[PDB]
Design a protein around this ligand. Structure first.
Ligand SMILES: O=C(O)[C@@H]1O[C@@H](O[C@H]2[C@H](O)[C@@H](NS(=O)(=O)O)[C@@H](O)O[C@@H]2COS(=O)(=O)O)[C@H](OS(=O)(=O)O)[C@@H](O)[C@@H]1O[C@H]1O[C@H](COS(=O)(=O)O)[C@@H](O)[C@H](O)[C@H]1NS(=O)(=O)O
Lengths: 189, 188, 189, 189, 189, 189
């Protein structure tokens, strides 16, 4: 019983100002979990979408700027796809862009420019070995939609060039999911 | 955001014995409401299934017997589709079968036999005037999925020949619905 | 169980004389109900036609004159189709023909001339909103054939030019109906 | 104004037990009249189906058993079509099956078995001469739908083998009729 | 007597400022009635467009901004189509965008960006059951053009992200309507 | 914004009796103005049909008789088309039919006979020079729909033969007009 749908979530991210003169970059990570998109249900149905299995097909991360188009001290960054839960260490002012030479690098124009990334994440099945599957719609694993313990999906790391002014963003993540085995429970009343 | 699916429910129905000698029948109706099939949800989502709209396509009533095959005093009855919520009056022992001559009559063997009906019900918009639409998948209306006030649908009435023994059935209903407008809400 | 048939009914209508010199018109309305065409039945069958549902397909209103061909002070009127239960107010001597500029106006030659109107009426489902369906034989609503409370169908308004002489008519309404679900009940005797 | 429809009626028939050891048969007859299927009407319409003429096209006699499938002392009988109102005399325990060598004989398995007969009856126009028409849909006579004096149609006789146990049946007769000349009368009220 | 035309109306909407730091959204509703587009007439014609029936085909809601392109604290919202008169409750600062996961969601870039929505509304025939028709130009119901009591059409709800600055808009609604049965009345003078 | 419609108006005309023995004719004129067909509107819309420009395409003058078919002293007259506002002088009993030799003459049988004339009128732009355009649907001038000062259109003159009895008529003029530039005004309320 397949049901392809779309789940979204919005949150903020700010790159604080720095008095540093050099071009330094701010590094951060981004994971994706389905608990943040799918709330708990009620009653005999533990989740709000009554299905048993799921598998995330795609994610769309949108960096919607919060800064005016008149803001100066512009910069240039990079967003890369990291499917293994080993990101570059979080840094405030690093002397280089680590994600620049990555094959999945897209340039981030800053601060007042929109940046989208559309990709297929991978689940963290074993963080010790960090193995994942290649892209195959027919062979992608089905995970279970747990009650409160779903596994973290992974796949984006960023590097933003710091500035004299604060750079704020409203980040909207949209997960395109595919459920299976409609499992609604209908007790009496 | 269409989503076809299937919902079901189970309950019992019995026909108490009668010392009457003549062939008499017992009458009873049957309504259909979605609140019985779809429990309430939790939190911001009032219903377990997050959509706004629905419109019933079909219903499948299943009279599963509870009796053995060796039971005697066999009889015969009838069921018919009634799309107005104005049925024949409920009765214990009536001297004729009202539902026999209706064009939508399907015979009912008794007591140990399976019986099924597969049709399109209709809603009750105005019980005074009792109007509805002909069968059309494209022009069917879209109803709202209320919080605790959904409308009763209709479409079946029955007539069972009485007997010396108690006739018990397990009734399974199955609905084929079609939702729209995925309306999930994700608070922090 | 479809059964298309034809039901008729006959009644009178008179436009009384007036001493008024001007050309004035007499306005009146005309509704259609199935109780006036279908009598009550007997016994377990509440109606004389043993069916459950109905829907009126067409109506033929015939103004059969009662006046001789030698009658003078002739006039000219109008009949229009009003599918919403909001007619022009009934008037005895109105200074104009209200139904003249209606798109459904047919001229009524008076007094000794035959006038027919053949159209599809509409039921009064909500008199507050006054909504109706367009003409579609396949999508027309089925109403219930009630016992003594059927709903009024609507669709004709008239305007007759007054005269020094009385203008009488014998009006024959014929409804072309379509029933469904033969529901005869046969108790013993 | 033709209207083909279907009228039904249900009643009981029992073959009482006998201590007789031999195989004996119980003989009985079955006539069909339209008064038992069509009740009287009400008012100016004397009958509930408002038509003038009729002619019975077919009849379906269904012997629905009332006995369990575990009942013993089973037997074998015969049902024949008798279109002339001269049946074998009614008998309780006759030493043979009279309807066995009839060209229209169908075997009746007893007691817990269903038996249907579908045929075209004939009316009793003259019981002295007992004449009837062959099967012709185009030339079949139209009778009048009388008020309380319709003529008996004929066409089935049976022979059931007796048993130590009582053999009950619920007999459902269905007549497929064809009416003509819709004659509804609509007085005022 | 069909006459397709276009009726417009302009009004304001402001999202007041908030000292709240989080990303919160301001929720509001939008209904459409023909009294706000069609004024009352004069004399025997109760309305200014002399027709009897109407049905709204489409509506175009245009959010024309009032804010300069230099305004900061930009945001992102959502507009959805709600054809049933049960909107998300009006809120000043809600912690999420309710209309984000709706199938009819269009993103609203704020504050200095134009947003249009072009759709087919539905009338509020029964607010208790809240039933409506699918899109069909041939089967769409005709309503009556009442004098002062027309029924509210429905179909848009919004969610605007709040800001430190006031966000003003000039909203221009354009209804594309279709009238029927020209009913002009011409008394003497 | 073109809208072709049809506007009507009804009024009386009587040819009084004369004791004169000779065959004499009664001459009269007939002009057409849109104020008599289109009433004043209400509010910001000065007219009831909300358009700016107009041009009359055709007019249908219908002489509907008021006299019985048994009336004697019958006669014969003439109706001609006069597109220039210079009619034959109005006369009570003229010794000849002036409109008889006109190229646009149609015979009027009197008194109990119907007479129609269907033609294209012309406006009175300059009564001193009396110039008009030939018939051309594509080149016909657009006039303005004034508030209370529209220009008179012209195009029919008649000659009725007098009689011992009074000859009454109900004259129904129907103008087929074509408007342009829908100009509805919708203030608030
Ligand atoms: O007691 C609760 O309500 C807990 O709900 C869930 O935690 C939510 C919290 O409910 C929610 N607020 S709400 O408006 O009350 O819904 C918001 O605070 O987020 C928190 C954290 O959610 S997150 O998904 O962890 O981010 C948890 O349940 S669930 O989301 O896993 O379903 C859990 O912490 C609580 O629910 C459990 O307890 C309920 C009450 O009974 S008892 O007193 O705990 O025995 C029980 O009925 C629930 O079934 C149970 N949740 S289960 O699904 O894990 O069984």
């Amino acid at each position: 019983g397949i049901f392809n749908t779309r789940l979204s979530r919005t949150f903020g991210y700010t790159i604080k100002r720095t008095t540093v003169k050099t071009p330094s970059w701010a590094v951060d990570m981004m994971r994706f979990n389905i608990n943040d998109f799918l709330p708990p249900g009620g009653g005999s149905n533990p989740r709000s979408v009554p299905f048993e299995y799921y598998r995330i097909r795609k994610v769309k991360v949108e960096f919607w700027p919060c800064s005016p188009i008149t803001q100066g001290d512009r910069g240039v960054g990079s967003s890369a796809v990291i499917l293994d839960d080993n990101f570059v260490t979080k840094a405030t002012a690093l002397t280089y862009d680590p994600y620049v030479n990555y094959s999945s690098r897209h340039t981030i124009t800053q601060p007042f420019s929109y940046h989208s990334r559309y990709f297929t994440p991978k689940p963290v099945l074993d963080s010790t070995i960090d193995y994942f599957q290649p892209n195959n719609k027919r062979n992608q694993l089905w995970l279970r939609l747990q009650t409160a313990g779903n596994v973290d999906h992974v796949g984006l790391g960023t590097a933003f060039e710091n500035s004299i002014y604060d750079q704020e963003y409203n980040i909207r993540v949209t997960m395109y999911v595919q459920f299976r085995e409609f499992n609604l429970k209908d007790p009496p009343l």
